[PDB]
Amino acid sequence: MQVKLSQERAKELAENASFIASPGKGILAADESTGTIQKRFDNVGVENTEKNRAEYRSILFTTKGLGKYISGCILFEETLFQQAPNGQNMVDLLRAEGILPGIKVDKGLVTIPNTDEEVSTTGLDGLAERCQKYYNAGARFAKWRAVLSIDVKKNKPSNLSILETAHTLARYAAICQENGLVPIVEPEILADGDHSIEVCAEVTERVLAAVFKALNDHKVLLEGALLKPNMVTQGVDCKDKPAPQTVGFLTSRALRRTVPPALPGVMFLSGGQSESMATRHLNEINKCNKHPWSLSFSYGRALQSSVLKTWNGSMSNAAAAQDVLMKLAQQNSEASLGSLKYIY
Amino acid sequence: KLSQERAKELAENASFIASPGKGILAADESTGTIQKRFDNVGVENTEKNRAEYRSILFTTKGLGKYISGCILFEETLFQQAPNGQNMVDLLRAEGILPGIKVDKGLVTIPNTDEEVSTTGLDGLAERCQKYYNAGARFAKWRAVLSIDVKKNKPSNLSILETAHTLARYAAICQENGLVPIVEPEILADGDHSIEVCAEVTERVLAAVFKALNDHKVLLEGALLKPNMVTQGVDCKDKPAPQTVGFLTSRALRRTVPPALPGVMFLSGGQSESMATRHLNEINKCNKHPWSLSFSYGRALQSSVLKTWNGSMSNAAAAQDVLMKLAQQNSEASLGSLKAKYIY
Amino acid sequence: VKLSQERAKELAENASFIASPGKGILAADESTGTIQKRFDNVGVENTEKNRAEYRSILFTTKGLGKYISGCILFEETLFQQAPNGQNMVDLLRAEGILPGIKVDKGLVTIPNTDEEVSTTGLDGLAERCQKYYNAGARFAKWRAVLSIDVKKNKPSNLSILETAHTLARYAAICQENGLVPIVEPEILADGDHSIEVCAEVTERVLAAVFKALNDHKVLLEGALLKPNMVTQGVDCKDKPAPQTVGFLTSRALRRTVPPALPGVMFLSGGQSESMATRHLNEINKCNKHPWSLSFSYGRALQSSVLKTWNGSMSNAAAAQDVLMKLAQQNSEASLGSLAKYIY
Amino acid sequence: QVKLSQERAKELAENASFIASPGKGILAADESTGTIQKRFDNVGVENTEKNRAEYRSILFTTKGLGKYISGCILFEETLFQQAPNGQNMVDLLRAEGILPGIKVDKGLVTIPNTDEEVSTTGLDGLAERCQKYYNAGARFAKWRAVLSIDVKKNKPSNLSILETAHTLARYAAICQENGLVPIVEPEILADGDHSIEVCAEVTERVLAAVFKALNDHKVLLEGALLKPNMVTQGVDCKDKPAPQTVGFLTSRALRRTVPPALPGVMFLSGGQSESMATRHLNEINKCNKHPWSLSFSYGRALQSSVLKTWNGSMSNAAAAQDVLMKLAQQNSEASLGSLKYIY
């Protein structure tokens, strides 16, 4: 347990972060907790037993050739320590595909006092010890989700929300790096509400400027980190649908205006977007310019909805489910290279 | 989401704790801190012996004349004395508010030279609710900063982390019914001058109070527990107690808004006597808009423990010594104990 | 460049003098374009002779120094002679009143804001302060302006940041060159926001201002603040009690202003002569406070004086009596002797 | 107009990208009267307006200079000056295809209560000067801020950095409002005996602060340029690092802090020789692919030998111009990494 980051440990983080950011690859977010996976399984009539969770994840992680398109897979703690039905460790299934295991290390959201229901992410207590344990089990990257809301009538996100988001993300990132894990820094601005794409662009640029200043103040090594931001879109209830081209351009611009080139990758979240839109948008983001970091994906639902539906709880559909995962992984791989087959 | 009635309860309790002539007894030593002290009087460090010792403190007749609050460790808040009475009921019978330590300890900040962060925000609201239900009405959380001129400590990062985390802790406490004691302790370690301590103390407090504002902490329902301004432990200079009084007063006057009802000093490694004398001098040198009092552990208990010496034969004598130290610190809190520095 | 003990001592003595109990500041520092307006309203031609006459009548009011500790001038007046050839500065000395000087050069818009503003005048400020000190000035004034608009999120972060940073630079430069800075972050009462919103904004803005003053090493002991009172907006249909303005102003200040600051000298804005006085009185009555709570009034001390003079020396005596009446009542207000809001 | 329009943003972005054109850099010819004095003293030339006009005319009539030079920064005198044959200096630059630029700062003053750290002046009336300069043909501006490293005195102080970042951001925003691309120059001096590692750490901290401020002030990075120091050891440091190390650490500092939307980073060379300024630029470009141009804005490094060759005689003008072209050429090749990891 050492406090100052050494050249050798910085190097391992940098190499791992660059690997995860490999051109044409992205992240499979398979890190649903027991409560979250309950809803996904409810949607397809499948009972949420530990057995069914092991079966479903083993199907994902034995998808032949998945490693051609997936560089990392974020796990929930259960799955990181779990074996598949045939006795193989989940981590060893990932290794066999050439996929780095990752681990969700946050403990969920609580309300910030004297805000209108804005939130803080918990989990700093014991984080170093959890990181050490996860590293020893084979995890090489981590994930922590902060959440911000846009509400123009209520002046959201508040200063206090942004300040809390930035400080706490920076602490988590510094602690990860101290204990061998590449942090994925995730400041998710929700798309809830009826604000325009212009308001999202303005909010996203301010938020990211604060987040990167904080990472600098906390001595986070950007070479050994990744960003997982929202794309810049209109709100879910906004009546003005911009083109996917405008989403692409304003997302690229927000990032070009705020993200230093030393960061090796930006791995987008898809939020409530459909499988198709999540891919089309990533493609548009990449086509509109040359960028000094990889622009790729860290998708959960946008890689799994159709897969869950196809599996439908039966090993007889395992092969079919795996093919659906490969199609989605493949199209997102192409979208990350801008190859799917100025506003100041 | 702070309501008028919650704000009012906080303000009343904070003003009570800061009552003129009263201060805080800190009885919140962990099993591990208690160990060495019980070793020196030949007493086994068991739960029942800690209850025995603390029951002596909490049945001291008239202690509530000088003590407004007593900070407990969790064990003690839920504990019974040897005769089966709840420790919390003993404090209530004295007219003393129970308080509770809610932090979980110190960890090093990455990429600093051994500078520290205080842990305990995870689950804090729920701990506060449980402690409130058990009778606690104020909380304690300690942050630590170090001075080192050569290494530029305390670093910007130490100060930012300190201010931000204290403010989060203070906000959560207030949301859940407890008055937070905000304690940014600047250690006296090292050989720096009193003037360096003064400059650092003023900077740190400016940062702390700005963060409390940013987090919407109600000052009217909080208290501060700072270091006094003193030279470092290895400093060869020995400033007069009048100078400690003046520079401590100046540092607080320059930084602490008058809406805060009380400043309850920590004593650090100061002797029982010096802790009282410094407090007196701080109060003597000026009029102040907040109470300037004490929140003392060892500076109220060292001679008490030594007098008790592990035996109930000496309990009444030990109580007499506590009353003497409690009284002299009460008097000190009212300023009534019985080239040049810029204004 | 580094504040010496004697320089620091002179600043602190002069700031305490300006804040002397029962005294306030006459703001007589209307620029040419501003006094045009006041003179228009009473049919008087804006010539320099008329300005010299009018100001010389103010500054020869017998006994004015009993109520007025300081008088802020415009540059013209600081170097001007009254009609009989006496220097205006010497008239003020004969009254026992310290001269002060407005040292800002006006407002310009901050780019990419909705018409929010920055105050200009830092270029050559040290050399202006030196020249003004030599001519007799011992305090300075600089006005920053902020607006409240909840829908547009005014005042913006950029407005607050620019206001705080620039006021701190000005303050520090004044102190380096012998002048006590009056720090004036004026939040306008324009618009229809509630008094609660004004309270909240005023507290945020003062927290940012005092933090910046700390960051720039401004000596609070040798400075003064000139804030808005906390009032509802001009177009707000609430009409809170004068007691509420008193309570919320006192609260905002108690929550943010360290006691080392010797005085808070309010601006009156668009308030009437009587309301400016009544509000000051209520602010003082509702609590004890560690700084003077007094006045730095222009219109509120002069509108009736000007209307009585009406451009004729035959009314000089009458005009002076009116000035003494308004100075007196404000002197008395400064001593407080003329479901619910959170404590 | 106060809000930057799409068309005016577009003009700034096009001009900034042009200045950053691959293989081109900036001739910094913006020496003030007092600075050019010193340069002329080295070659025994009298500092008269005629000599300044003569020398600059020789620079600006160098045949083919615009193949290597995209922009030339002028001092105000020169912007409004005629060369000896009656042509405007600005027209000489236009004939070369070079954009005229203008220095808009008014020099350095000390920040109070620092150890001789400095603030850059010139915000007062900047908008109006920018307009007048634009009308005269200028399309970009420059403002120099200065920071010092001194590990024993903890320089650069927080105050130095805060002041530097805030004031640069104000200047940049005002330039953009009035049609000029701002060169943002936070120069960290190489004075002292600190290591290259200390310079790396300080540079990264300063740049992080500067870019956050630029964001807070709504500065359009697409229409701006950066002029930073290279990362080098101090002038009196006894360890000489490899040119490759300067290359790498400079790239790394920028990669860690400068968003890609900025089109160009145009280095200052400080005390470096003509050769070292070029070699270092080449190494910076060679060590990586970068999303902004890495080029030069050189004064002495493009001019020392030119001045020495000229020697105050028009009969050496052609020889002087050939020297300029040689140095312009080599720096052009260096800006493409074509001269002919530490975490």
Angle at which helix B156-175 crosses helix B194-214, to 10 degrees, equals 50
Residues 65-104 of B with CB under 8 A from C: none
Catalytic residue among C95, C184, C203, C282: C184
Calpha distance C2→B107 (Å, rounded)? 38
DSSP 3-state of A197: helix
Chain-centroid distance, C-alpha D306: 19
Q: How far apart are the first and last CA of chain A?
A: 47
Q: By CA distance, what is A215's nearest residue in D?
A: D208
Give the residue from C9, C11, C213, C255 with the most B CB atoms within 10 Å of its CB, the best one to mutate.
Answer: C255
Touching subunits of D (3+ CB pairs, under 8 Å) are A, C
Partnered with residue A104 across adjacent β-strands are A143
For residue C173, the chain D residues in CB contact (below 8 A) are: 112
Cβ neighbour number for residue D84 with a 10 Å cutoff: 11
Task: Map tokens 């509702």 to a residue.
Answer: C286
Question: To the nearest whole angstrom, how far is the Cα of D323 from the nearest Cα of chain A?
Answer: 37
**What domains are there in chain D, each with its CATH number?**
1-343 (3.20.20.70)
- Which three-class secondary structure string do you get for B118-132? ECCCCCHHHHHHHHH
C204, C254, C260 ranked by CB distance to B259: nearest: C254
Task: Map tokens 């103010």 to a residue.
Answer: C58
Question: To the nearest whole angstrom, how far is the Cα of B163 from the nearest Cα of chain C?
Answer: 13
Cβ neighbour number for residue A78 with a 10 Å cutoff: 17
For residue B121, the chain A residues in CB contact (below 8 A) are: 122, 124-125
Residue D175 · residue D142 · CB < 8 Å:
no
Q: Does C251 touch chain B (CB under 8 A)?
A: yes
Residue A266 is classified by DSSP as E
Residues 6+ apart with CB under 8 A from C206: C185, C225, C227, C252, C253, C256, C257
Residue A189 · residue A150 · CB < 8 Å:
yes
A210, A260, A342 ranked by CB distance to D259: nearest: A260
Calpha distance B308→B132 (Å, rounded)? 31
| C-alpha distances out from residue D155 to B115, C84, C289, D150, D161, Å | 21, 55, 39, 5, 9
Chain-centroid distance, C-alpha A82: 22
Q: What is the DSSP pairing of strand B97-101 with strand B138-145? A: parallel
Partnered with residue B264 across adjacent β-strands are B293
Partnered with residue B172 across adjacent β-strands are none
Amino acid sitting at position D334: A
Question: To the nearest whole angstrom, how far is the Cα of C114 from the nearest Cα of chain D?
Answer: 8
Cβ neighbour number for residue D338 with a 10 Å cutoff: 12
For residue A163, the chain B residues in CB contact (below 8 A) are: 164, 214
Amino acid sitting at position B271: S
Size of interface C-D (CB pairs under 8 A): 75
Instruction: Say whether C184 is catalytic.
Output: yes
Residues 6+ apart with CB under 8 A from A137: A80, A81, A91
Q: Does B112 touch chain A (CB under 8 A)?
A: yes
Q: What is the DSSP pairing of strand B291-296 with strand B262-265? A: parallel
- Whether B216 sits inside 8 A of A110 (CB atoms) is no
What are phi and psi for residue C70, nearest 5 degrees?
A: -150, 150
Query: Which candidate, B254, B341, B248, B340, places its Cα nearest to that of B293?
Result: B248
Q: Does B39 touch chain A (CB under 8 A)?
A: no
Query: Which candidate, A31, A200, A156, places its Cα nearest to that of A106?
Result: A31
For residue A206, the chain D residues in CB contact (below 8 A) are: 215
Q: By CA distance, what is A173's nearest residue in B?
A: B110
Angle at which helix C316-333 crosses helix C299-309, to 10 degrees, equals 160
Is the peptide bond preceding residue B289 cis, with omega within 30 degrees of 0?
no
Query: Which candidate, D231, D227, D224, places its Cα nearest to that of D297?
Result: D227
Q: By CA distance, what is B289's nearest residue in C?
A: C290
| C-alpha distances out from residue C64 to A99, A101, B118, B149, C21, Å | 85, 81, 57, 52, 15
- Whether D260 sits inside 8 A of A216 (CB atoms) is no
Alpha-carbon torsion angle A197, A202, A205, A208, nearest 10:
-90
Of all residues in chain D, what percent are helix, strand and coil, respectively (each to 5)?
50, 15, 35
Chain-centroid distance, C-alpha A151: 24
| DSSP per-residue codes, A118-180 | -EEE---TTHHHHHHHHHHTT--EEEEEEEE--BGGGTBSPHHHHHHHHHHHHHHHHHHHHTT
Chain-centroid distance, C-alpha A75: 11
For residue A155, the chain C residues in CB contact (below 8 A) are: 150, 153
Residue B308 · residue B314 · CB < 8 Å:
yes
Partnered with residue A110 across adjacent β-strands are A120
- Whether A155 sits inside 8 A of C153 (CB atoms) is yes
* Structure-solving method: X-ray
Question: To the nearest whole angstrom, how far is the Cα of C153 from the nearest Cα of chain A?
Answer: 7
For residue A159, the chain C residues in CB contact (below 8 A) are: 157
Touching subunits of C (3+ CB pairs, under 8 Å) are A, B, D
Residue D109 · residue D140 · CB < 8 Å:
no
- Whether C172 sits inside 8 A of D3 (CB atoms) is no
Calpha distance A73→A303 (Å, rounded)? 12
Q: Does D174 touch chain C (CB under 8 A)?
A: yes
What are phi and psi for residue A319, nearest 5 degrees?
A: -65, -45
Query: Which candidate, B42, B160, B16, places its Cα nearest to that of B95?
Result: B16
Cβ neighbour number for residue C159 with a 10 Å cutoff: 22
Q: What is the DSSP pairing of strand B179-186 with strand A119-121? A: unpaired
Give the residue from B162, B215, B217 with the most A CB atoms within 10 Å of its CB, the best one to mutate.
Answer: B215
What are phi and psi for residue D225, nearest 5 degrees?
A: -140, 155
Calpha distance C212→C161 (Å, rounded)? 9
Catalytic residue among A55, A228, A275, A284: A228
Calpha distance A230→D274 (Å, rounded)? 47
Residue A320 is classified by DSSP as H
Residues 6+ apart with CB under 8 A from A193: A149, A150, A151, A152, A235, A236, A237, A238
With residue A56 as reference, give the H or E element that holds it. Answer: helix A50-61
Query: Which candidate, B161, B215, D260, places its Cα nearest to that of A174?
Result: B161
Instruction: Say whether B153 is catalytic.
Output: no
What are phi and psi for residue D147, nearest 5 degrees?
A: -125, 150
Touching subunits of B (3+ CB pairs, under 8 Å) are A, C
For residue C157, the chain A residues in CB contact (below 8 A) are: 159
Rg, Å, chain D Cα set: 19
| DSSP per-residue codes, D6-46 | HHHHHHHHHHHHHHT-TT-EEEEE---HHHHHHHHHHTT--
Q: Does B203 touch chain C (CB under 8 A)?
A: yes
Size of interface A-D (CB pairs under 8 A): 74
Residue D337 · residue D250 · CB < 8 Å:
no
Q: By CA distance, what is D12's nearest residue in A?
A: A344
Q: Does C214 touch chain B (CB under 8 A)?
A: yes
**And the tokens for D10?**
């577009």
Calpha distance B302→B40 (Å, rounded)? 11
With residue A80 as reference, give the H or E element that holds it. Answer: helix A77-80
What are phi and psi for residue D190, nearest 5 degrees?
A: -85, 0
Calpha distance B24→C36 (Å, rounded)? 62
For residue D343, the chain A residues in CB contact (below 8 A) are: 5, 7, 10-11, 14, 221, 223-224
Residues 281-310 of D with CB under 8 A from A: 289-291
| C-alpha distances out from residue D267 to A119, A257, D126, D241, D281, Å | 43, 21, 24, 19, 8
**And the tokens for B279?**
């407090």
Q: Does C161 touch chain B (CB under 8 A)?
A: no
Is the peptide bond preceding residue A244 cis, with omega within 30 degrees of 0?
no
What are phi and psi for residue B38, nearest 5 degrees?
A: -70, -25
A235-268 per-residue burial string, b: 16 or more CB within 10 A, e: under 16: beebeeebeeebbbbbbbbbbbbbbbbbbbbbbb
Residue B2 · residue B175 · CB < 8 Å:
yes
Give the residue from C160, C254, C261 with the most B CB atoms within 10 Å of its CB, the best one to mutate.
Answer: C254
Question: To the nearest whole angstrom, how far is the Cα of C165 from the nearest Cα of chain A?
Answer: 18
In sequence order, what E strands does chain D have? 25-29, 69-74, 99-103, 108-110, 118-120, 140-147, 181-188, 225-226, 264-267, 293-298
| Positive or negative torsion for Cα A129, A135, A137, A140 | positive
**And the tokens for B54?**
């603390």
